[PDB]
Amino acid sequence: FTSDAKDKPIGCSVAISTYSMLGHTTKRSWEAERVMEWLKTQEWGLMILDEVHTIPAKMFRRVLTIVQAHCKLGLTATLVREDDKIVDLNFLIGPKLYEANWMELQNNGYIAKVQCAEVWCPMSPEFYREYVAIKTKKRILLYTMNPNKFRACQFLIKFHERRNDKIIVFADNVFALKEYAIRLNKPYIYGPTSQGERMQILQNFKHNPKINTIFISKVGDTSFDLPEANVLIQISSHGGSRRQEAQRLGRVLRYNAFFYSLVSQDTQEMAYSTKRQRFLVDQGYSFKVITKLAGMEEEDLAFSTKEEQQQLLQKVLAATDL
Amino acid sequence: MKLNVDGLLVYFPYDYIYPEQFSYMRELKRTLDAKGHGVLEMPSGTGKTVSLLALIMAYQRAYPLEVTKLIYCSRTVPEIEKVIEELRKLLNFYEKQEGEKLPFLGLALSSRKNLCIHPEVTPLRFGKDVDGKCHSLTASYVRAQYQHDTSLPHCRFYEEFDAHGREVPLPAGIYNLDDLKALGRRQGWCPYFLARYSILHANVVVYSYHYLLDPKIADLVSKELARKAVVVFDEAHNIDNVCIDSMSVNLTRRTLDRCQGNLETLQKTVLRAEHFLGFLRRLLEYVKWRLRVQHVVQESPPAFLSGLAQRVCIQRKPLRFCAERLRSLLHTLEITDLADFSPLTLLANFATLVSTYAKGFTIIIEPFDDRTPTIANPILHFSCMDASLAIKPVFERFQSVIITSGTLSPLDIYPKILDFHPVTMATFTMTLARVCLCPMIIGRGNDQVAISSKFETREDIAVIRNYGNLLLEMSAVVPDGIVAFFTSYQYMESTVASWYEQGILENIQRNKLLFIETQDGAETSVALEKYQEACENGRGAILLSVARGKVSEGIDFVHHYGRAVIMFGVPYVYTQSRILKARLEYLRDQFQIRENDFLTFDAMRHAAQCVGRAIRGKTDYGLMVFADKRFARGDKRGKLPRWIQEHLTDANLNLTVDEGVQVAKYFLRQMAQPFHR
Amino acid sequence: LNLPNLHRVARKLDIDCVQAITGFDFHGGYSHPVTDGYIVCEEFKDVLLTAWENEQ
Amino acid sequence: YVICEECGKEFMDSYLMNHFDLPTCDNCRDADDKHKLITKTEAKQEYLLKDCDLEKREPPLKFIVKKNPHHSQWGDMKLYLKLQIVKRSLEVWGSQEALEEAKEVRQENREKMKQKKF
DNA sequence: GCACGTCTATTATCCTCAGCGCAATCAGCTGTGACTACCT
DNA sequence: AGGTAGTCACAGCTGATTGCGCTGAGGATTAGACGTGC
């Protein structure tokens, strides 16, 4: 029941739908209205909720009260959430039943032993002056488009492609991701592209040796059907969302694999990365700090000279969204 | 084993029951309790028959009064023999699990050629003369003259059956056609005559569609057998086509020449009643008038008799006496054989049909021929237009007619194509331990150009190059046989000629052997045999054919035969001949059927019928590809059977050739691992 | 009647309209018929003229 | 027998009854003005009706499929009875009332959207 | 008498128009995280 | 010093619109024979 095929939801044993449709605050579709009227007239056994962590919302909570069910079973992988609304989930649904021990889970070999990495790059002088000069929230793009971080990401991409490893590159701030992906001429998901284009890109991502690296803009921050990947490189993620980082780490496991996080020194990204890894260290993961990359000057990388690095300043300051 | 349905227990030869079979049994029991008709859809040719027979036997045991006679009409003789042997296996299982016999009789019916013991008529290959020779050898006059024991060669099986086979019945023992022939030859009886005598005291019987859809024989074979009976038409996705062809006749120069040749002999025999002797003589010239008239088309189903009553001024009533004349006058003339006589009978049948049935028909005359259009060929065909005409006598005489096949995806068009009142609307999708089929629709090629089989782009070079490249790089990933279907023979030959012109067909040849299906039956048979023997070893081969051909349904591509089935474009029937358009108009103004909707339904029905023959059996697996962007639209995907819809993910609906090849490689690589039962 | 696009008006009115041939031109190495107006029934002539004027 | 709503004369079968279940004989069949047939798209545009309002709201509205003179192979025009369409529109939107303001605010919103796009 | 350059010819074939149903597109609402300012 | 109302960057969803795809029917434009040079 998602207003896409309408496979006669009336008179069904198991019904599968999504949020934001059972709690509509506006006028509803006639067929959808009739389906909801039918659905609100009978009891439900074992109402299953997915991604329960984002249950305590303004409209998602009343979804529990808008339908009647006997048992409410919630499933999630990242129970961590800000705004301390997880306590509300104790009485909204029930108590925390089971919490898997990830360390012993990966010790059995059924979960990939991901070697977590936290490697930072120094801020180029052409960028740090502008970073310390501006404070009105325009510095988000500055450390995001750090030339040193760009070189590190390109080096990691090339190294892992040379050994035939599937790579997923997470990157928020899709504006930066545009010039981050078109520079290397690699597929990227802007996010409001289409439904078909994303599906075919992800479908040909796995069974193709020619292309094995993609860029994602906050779209992979949920439970999707992304294929198996061994390398994850996140750049300029959200502020302090431990849930987002835990989900991104969850997209790799299924040292079989390893994921890297790139941050800029002497910036808010350092504090953000420090405060958003406290969930995984409680889970047992340790983030090794990498300050030097072997063979950085062995091959040619982008932004080799200062000319294009200083040219990047004009285009990164060209936003002027006022 | 013993399956416990909600109000009965049914013995099943196989201990393990798939959920699809259980749901099918549930639905069929519901229909039988509903005392009404219905339509079903199953994806397996095998395993449906055993479940159907088991449920029928259980229902007969539970309710002997409700069900008395069973009909399992099928398409051809192999289906008849396989269902007979399946019933034999079921009966043997019941006997070994129960220990006592039951008075159930099961026989198979076919043509007199199939069931005959005279060695003087078997070697000949004349299906229109075997019945005539059988009638000449033994008939009412033969029985009358046998009293004096005339010394002349005649069939003697009946002369012994009428005195010895009309007293001993066959209460128990289901008999196959070979069993019937053996019993007849050991008892000196005709298998056909004992079959006729034994149908009354019988439990089940199987035969072809022609014994029920054709009114000229259904009444003789089924008149008062059982008022309350159950009939099922398995594999009847093309029931409308055969129903239309049942009341369809054709006329050519050969028919009229044969009639004018044989009427002189008939008159010579006569001069050695009068209401028809002079009546038959002048009928030929009215239809020969259209031979000398050079007109494109004449349509007048009601006014044809009006025009007949003008040139010769003949009443319409005596036409209705023509058919009943066949059994009366001819037997008085003592016809030696039906050779050189069938066109005269079919002319009378046509006259009776046009005299009686003219409400939903059309008369068409075509002065066109293949490669010799206008020399001398006015073909008159009394093509039927409504499929309900051939289906009324079975709906009004039966209670729970069931139409089931492997492709009945639109359940809303069959109840309105023919007058029908379904109460089921039931579909079933087979499930196994692994996905046995990987359907996918290939849109634009590597050049980002659509490969649609559009009429305006049939001669386009780019689409032909893309088709050739797809067939080449596909032939190297799926081994031991690929079955490709084209729209028509003309398009197929024009495509292969273009491929031969370029240096591309050699690349396919060096990978797999290419075999082309032609109209010749012997050539097609030998091509199929050599394709099978080439696919037996590692050579591999490609079988190129047409969707609307006798090879599409004549053979089944079981596992290891045709791992991939390719559809080169949506198969659309040719709009010419002014026959399809008449049916479209009739459906538009009568059943409110959209012309485009019906064309799409027919195209997708043929495509699914010719693509679903690659999966026969649970262990069988195969690949199915559609090489046309037009398949990508929902209006055509929705016409695919439900057991293929769920496996056609939205990810692969418009993917290019390279990604389709990659998907095929992954599917074949992952499907080769052992699975358990 | 020598009216341009008169056939289209006749087609929309389902009125018989046949092109009038007055000669043949041999331009381009081949003979092509020359069409001068359209021949329409006088009974429908009055109705056709008004319809053609409205269409124009 | 069926009693005509215009003349009251009993009849067995009529064109309107067969195609639209309308109890009106062919003698009183005013197919030119009162029983005018309009295309499906035209009815949806004029009366702002949706497919569910035409196929799912009881009673279901029947239609007559006729060939398109302009082009043969295109989808044939679906003709609905104007009286039934008007009755359904009145049942859905109430009457010839505020729906008229509704179409005005719809075109106003269209102008707002186009100026916003500009 | 032979071959080459030049003047002329008594009906055929190929690029562009026309209503409905499916898929693409935007408006409105919400989530999720941080940022920020004013009052108790 | 902490709580709350806004504000902003991305993302999701569903509810209308809203141009685009299904095929057949229209109006445009090289070779044979004669003069002549060898």
Ligand code: SF4
């Ligand atoms: S009566 Fe039977 S055995 Fe004799 S010719 Fe006919 S079919 Fe053959």
Ligand SMILES: [Zn+2]
């Ligand atoms: Zn009346």
